[PDB]
Amino acid sequence: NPIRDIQDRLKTAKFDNKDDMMNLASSLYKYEKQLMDSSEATLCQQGLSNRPNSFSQLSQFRDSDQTGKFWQNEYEACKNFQTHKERRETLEQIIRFLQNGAEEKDADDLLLKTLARAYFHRGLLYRPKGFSVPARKVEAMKKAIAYCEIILDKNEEESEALRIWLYAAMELRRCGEEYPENFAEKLFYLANDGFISELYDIRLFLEYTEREEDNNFLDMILQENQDRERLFELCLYKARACFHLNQLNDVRIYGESAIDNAPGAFADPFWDELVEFIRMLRNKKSELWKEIAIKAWDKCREKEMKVGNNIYLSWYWARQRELYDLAFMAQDGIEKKTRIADSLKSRTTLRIQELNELRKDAHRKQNRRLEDKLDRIIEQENEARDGAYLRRNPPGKREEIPFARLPQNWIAVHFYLNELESHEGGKGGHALIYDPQKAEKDQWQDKSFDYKELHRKFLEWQENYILNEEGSADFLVTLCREIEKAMPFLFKSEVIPEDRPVLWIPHGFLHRLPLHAAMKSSNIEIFWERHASRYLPAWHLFDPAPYSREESSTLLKNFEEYDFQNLENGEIEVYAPSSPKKVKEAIRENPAILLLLCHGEADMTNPFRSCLKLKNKDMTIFDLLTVEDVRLSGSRILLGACESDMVPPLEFSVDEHLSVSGAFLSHKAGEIVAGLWTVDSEKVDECYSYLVEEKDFLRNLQEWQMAETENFRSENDSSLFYKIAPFRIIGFPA
Amino acid sequence: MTTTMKISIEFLEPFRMTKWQESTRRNKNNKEFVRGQAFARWHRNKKDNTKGRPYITGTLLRSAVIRSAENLLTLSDGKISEKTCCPGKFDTEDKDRLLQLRQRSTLRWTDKNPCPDNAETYCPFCELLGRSFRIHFGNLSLPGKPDFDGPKAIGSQRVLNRVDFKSGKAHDFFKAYEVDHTRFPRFEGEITIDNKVSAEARKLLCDSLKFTDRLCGALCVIRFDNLAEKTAEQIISILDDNKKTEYTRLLADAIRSLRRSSKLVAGLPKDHDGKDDHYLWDIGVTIRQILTTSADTKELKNAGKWREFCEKLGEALYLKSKDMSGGLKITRRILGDAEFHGKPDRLEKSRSVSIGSVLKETVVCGELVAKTPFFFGAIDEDAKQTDLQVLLTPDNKYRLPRSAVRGILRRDLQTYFDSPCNAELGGRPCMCKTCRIMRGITVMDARSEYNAPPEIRHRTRINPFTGTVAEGALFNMEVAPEGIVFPFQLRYRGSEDGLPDALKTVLKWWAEGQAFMSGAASTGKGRFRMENAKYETLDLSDENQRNDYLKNWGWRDEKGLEELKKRLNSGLPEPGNYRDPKWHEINVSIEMASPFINGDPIRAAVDKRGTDVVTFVKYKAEGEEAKPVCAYKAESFRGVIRSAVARIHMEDGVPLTELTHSDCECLLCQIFGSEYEAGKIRFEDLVFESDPEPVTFDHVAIDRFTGGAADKKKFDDSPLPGSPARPLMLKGSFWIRRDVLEDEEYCKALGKALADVNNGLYPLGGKSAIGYGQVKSLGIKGDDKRISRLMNTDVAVPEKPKTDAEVRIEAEKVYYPHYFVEPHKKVEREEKPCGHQKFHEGRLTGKIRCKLITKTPLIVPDTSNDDFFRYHKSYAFFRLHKQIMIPGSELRGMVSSVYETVTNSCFRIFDETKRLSWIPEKARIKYKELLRVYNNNPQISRTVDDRMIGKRMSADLRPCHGDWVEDGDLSALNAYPEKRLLLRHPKGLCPACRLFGTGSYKGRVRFGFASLENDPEWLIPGKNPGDPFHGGPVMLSLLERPRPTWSIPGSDNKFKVPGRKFYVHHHAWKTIKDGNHPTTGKAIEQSPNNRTVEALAGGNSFSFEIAFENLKEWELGLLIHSLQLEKGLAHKLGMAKSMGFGSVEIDVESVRLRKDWKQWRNGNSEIPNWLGKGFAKLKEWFRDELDFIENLKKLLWFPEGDQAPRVCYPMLRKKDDPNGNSGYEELKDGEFKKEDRQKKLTTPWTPWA
RNA sequence: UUGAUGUCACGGAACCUUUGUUGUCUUCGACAUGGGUA
Ligand SMILES: [Zn+2]
Ligand SMILES: [Zn+2]
Ligand SMILES: [Zn+2]
Ligand SMILES: [Zn+2]
């Protein structure tokens, strides 16, 4: 016990020796800290034996009389725990106890260094909240730099103080904040001092040599051992040094080694360092960044979580888009570029808070098979933050569908928006077409365009539509004209031959545009007059199947504002009181034709929380995904206004969101029909009545579009064209 | 040539200002400079010092005028008088030269392209823009241009945070200055025109100037036409000279609390006697005299001067006292700096939208009434005495910040829509429902007439293991009172027909009384209610209405608001789609049948009454006055409920009371919140359903050796009285979220905790060891029977066994009143006692029902009034609400003495410092203490002992946590924490201290009050034959202190303490009933030295309660034995035990045990087992050395019939007795020699004559 | 003390976590004085 230890130390005390005084002070401070925190040791209710001698010794010791050594030892005791929570709480305690002692004017170098290191570690341990770095982290690094600066005001060549200062400066540079003052001068004072054999100073030495053109340390850097646990850091630093030494073959070999041996979580700084290295090599005109970027993308694409069929999940990384921009430009083959572009579509990326929320929902829904994997991902991401500082390194694929599966009477069109290329002043857009009835070598084409004006017009139309609803038909017309003017190759008849339906696979904001309704500049012709159209969220969802066999229909409606004449008083069965129970029964019934005319509400933070508004209940899309014994193979679905209702406003041009279309695609639904924006009730009634009256859906949609576009063109009515426009088909049955 | 135009702007609210920066930093890459662009500016006369004045630039006014002109043009469909207006130009080829660009969407009213770049004429809008200087906007400055020392001379800096919605905690903030409009209400400038501007352009400029409604973050109207240091030094010097340095913090707190009024100085408390000899205010001149003259001085006569004087003294004393510590210095305010500014992007796309020609403004007016205390955090860095502080204006008035009101509106709108907004600072505006609604809302800043000082509450933290307050856990918080009324105003400019449905629903929620608007909402702070609401709609699309609005400036000054309020209509619209609130109210009713107390040392020291402990009282704002009322703290209630919830739940085998709860996700954290989250339940203060005044109860500590009152602080408390016949009713409510009410697990946990609290296991308030705060029942309402569902054999007890004590009583000899019981020389100590953090397995928790029956006249005087029957004093039997009672402290002490003697524990209460009596440091101190013996006594020299009385007994038998008796002074180690270890025993706690507790450990037994169960039977008939509830008087003989020198004759080392004093049972009260003396037989005469009392007779019956928790089988066996001793033994209780008064007997009748949280069992069929286990434990400790047990049984042997022993003290000499008995003078040189005295006094029942 | 064809800062709640608790019968009999004596 603390009292027993104090008694033992007091028994053998020498007033001229030092070690006795340090031990006695350490025991007293330990007892006082144990008194500070309400631990279980407070139940001890004894005193000290030999009262006169003990009192005399205590009085003499207090009259004669380190804090810094004790708190240092506490710090190294903290620096080898297994749990980040334990490390964090211990660091909080250490900082809280050291504040006043350091604030005292006559503070010592050991005390100030300990506090600075504690601040640096706590700043490193901070967690993310949203789209930007926390401010507490930056303030912690600033505090560490302030402590090092006050130490360096008095003393000049403190190795550890200079190292901590440089670590804080480099981490600030890694964050959005720019460098501090005198950074080059300090980096020059430490370069002059000497050479340390540490992974976490090799970065500083690499920066110094790359800045001041001094390759003296590269020999020592390259001649390091290979008996460590973070071998990828050695491989990357050796590759950089060899590149400074022009030993390009060695650079390459270290490149494949580093890419082959890499960690899982993206919180490790290794991935950011790799991306920075690739960008530097590209800027320096060395033609091996292409192969390095290709291999890095190939390694990186396999990190994802499978929830539900045809749906995948991932954790957010800032530079993934940039890396996928660097790999796309590196690739030369058109088919490989198409694969790289398709690697991003139909994928959901979430943050720590969203992952925790979905884990809680799964726990409430009793899904161990998913909860365990979520906990593994969360704890891995949490633990992989300070692995570089603490010298630790804790430890699938999917099949590819050949492009030859397309029929002989179809054309496939892919899209991809290269943000980095657009920022470089070039044409960021890319249209990648494919043609089955041509020579094997000449079966692919690459077309480029600019999308800045199109994005501006889309934003203007979206703002107007949100503000005044129907008072934006002219803006929609302008948007369609902009689409046609920005992609003129659709109307040349040599790239896309006549009588050949097209299959659109958009990427980014192009999902929410009517590409099938492009207007060519009073003679005006519409795109749909020449070819039909289909849509797919991604190419890897391609899986043709036949239709159903039994004949039946079902209607699920929660719309009291409008009564659908033909739909209700017709051939299909009517269920006005549509509850979640009856909805589940309908999905499990496997009908031939299904309709769902209800409302919805979006969710901008968690995509899985978007709700369908039913009678006295709200059914999230996640609940739709997690339904047992679902039978919908080879069945058509007509949907309603909910799909257009639960779409959040777009913010970034390369953003994507999941909806009921994807939810029903996960159930292998034969087809889906839905609108892009708020549809009209009477037009919905007429169109769906025609669609259920006939069998084929593509022919129905084409004939209906021609029938009503005749009436439109008879008078040039933008308000009517606004009603004709929002209609499309998703899926590809047999 | 040009023409000038004077301009003046008058703010209706405080406006924000930015800090000075160097010209090098004044660029577009500086985030702070870019952020501080819409505020005012500070100009320095010279850049060395901060002397200067503020100003406003003309560019901001130009931008505001342009925005107003655009709004007017879209309202008017692009026409001024006869000329159409082009949409203007906002495109620049060289963007790098522009410090700031436009992010909002420009308004659209026409389809024509802008004018040509080079043209001979321009539209009025283009002329106003300046595409041809046409219009020049000057700088706005104060009239006369005065100079101030710095920015802090006109305003103060305030922190403004951003609160996360999902969690409920802020992670970043920013700072800005604030200047009050009362002192700095107006600025003036000029506008110059080039004498060629069209009349249409001038009309548009005038209309835009009138339409501009706010600037610099405030609403505006634009028209065109030193004894404290000395006193602190004196007080500190006096305290240092008198060595009373430990009371500095308490003195500072008292002096600070005196700021309420100067009349409190005249009514400072006094000592018990009534003279000016207080332990705090008369340390010295004296502190009382210093404060008196300070209040007397003419310059401090003023109230504000007195207030600032008291605050300065408190701060100075606090800073002086802070440095006296000698250990680790912890800091609780840490790791909060998260300053962050928005970053407006420069690559933003340019957009244009058409909102339409329809526009309506809806005005809403009312009040905001504070139903509970509120707390708006605003901590000043210079004032360090108080931890948490509130926001006040420069004239010391409460404030209701627009920032807080707007944030609460945004939170409520998000709650209604059920869709959090994840927008980030910078970029184009967000386009969600909440942001769209909030973009058109305007709110005002209010203040109150009430300007009294704030009231401050203290808070602590309880150690779950030892049961006492945690070490170094004390902090205080300022709280504003309840009942303050703030004016309320709200304007919504939008295109919708009336207000939105979401706003209507939120306003209805506020009207119903769910405006949780302030901080500290967990402890029930800041609930408001909207009342006297009025509203109207104004259609600005109409030409005449728009012209009237522009002419009257929209009625924002008071002179227009007066007419607008006349035009207003009473009521509020009902919503179309109403959604229920997120919180539900639960009512609480508590019934208490015992006294109650909630300590507050600051009020105890400040109040005129000299009581040590007082109850908590809070003030209510009645207009511009205050009204104290007694209540129970919401913090204390929350702590009790949380402990009850935690102590019965476990996580992976670990009780929740042991976990750190830092970054935790346990049931307790999810329900009650944590540092990283917000709680889901809010507690409010409870108020009694009456206005009962406090009473006064006084106590005393009895020395175990002398038998008199130890020289301790005679203490008293002021609880609120209660009785079984007149219980205390306590009422209140707490709020619970709907999700918690839906969660079955949380409902079950809360129900279990409430059931345990209702069963009577968790007392409320302090001093519960003596029966204070016993909850009789508890119930709740308004939960739809979801939590109250869980809030829902008698064999004859064995009789006592016959005693074995045998004593021979002759009928010729006279005996002595008291004898000593010599204890064993072995005490069984233990270092670690049982913990309070859970209900340990294998231990028993339950209740005991006792039954006390009187056998001899009992006296328990009521000392509130010392002249009941008419110098000569008089007293009456203890009564409370006209009901005869016995306090629980008397029974606790009576049982504790016998338990200590049985278990052979330490002397629990003892006077170690007393020194008896009959160059080096030893000689002088003996001389200094000798003069006080001569100079103070009611009645060759003394033989002063060289050692204190504490050294005259075995070290094992001294108190465990005692005083310092060894040579040397511990005053050196006052600051250092190791002082306590030099006072405690090296081996731990004895069995008595384990059960009844000590100063650093909580006990495990609680004693309740006792009630008489029948009509009283008085010893003497009363004055009124028709009043059987009052008795007559009886005159007792003289009573005097004991003399310890009788049991310790000489100073030789062979004399030691003999043991514990005990009194015998006899029938000498018969002579006291008559007028005869006990021993001389003469008549007792009235004198101012003796007393008169009211006494009961035999046969009366009482009954009381004992509660215990975590007791082993052997511990409970000995406790029951100490109550029901034997058949033929009796206790002693009350006053005048030496004369025979006050022999009682206890009889146990029922024992009930606790099995789990719901099921209780009758434990009457296990008393023989516990008694057997108790005796076995004594055998192993003492095999056959059990002689103190039988000596105790001899002294407690009650005489039977056919026996009448004669017991009385001897007289001094043989010349003063009619009976011819021996005397003290001849007994000393007789059988009672010095070398044989101790042997005689140790044998029970031995005669002296 | 501003600079001009471009300022949503009424674009941001100082927010979140801690029982003034613990220990005490309003109790009661031996002297007091300096020398006395020599
Ligand atoms: Zn113009
Ligand atoms: Zn928003
Ligand atoms: Zn917890
Ligand atoms: Zn003890």
Author numbering:
A (entry chain B): 3 to 67, 75 to 404, 409 to 534, 538 to 750
B (entry chain A): 1 to 132, 146 to 238, 260 to 318, 327 to 834, 840 to 917, 930 to 977, 1230 to 1250, 1292 to 1540, ...
What does the report in the manuscript say about this coordinate set?
The type III-E CRISPR-Cas system is a newly identified bifunctional complex with nuclease activity and protease activity that holds great potential for RNA editing applications. Here, we report cryo-electron microscopy (cryo-EM) structures of Desulfonema ishimotonii (Di) Cas7-11-crRNA, complexed with or without the full length or the N-terminus of TPR-CHAT. The Cas7 domains, arranged in a row, form a crescent-shaped filament, with the INS and CTE domain completing the structure. The Cas11 domain is positioned at the crescent’s midpoint, and interacts with Cas7.2 and Cas7.3.
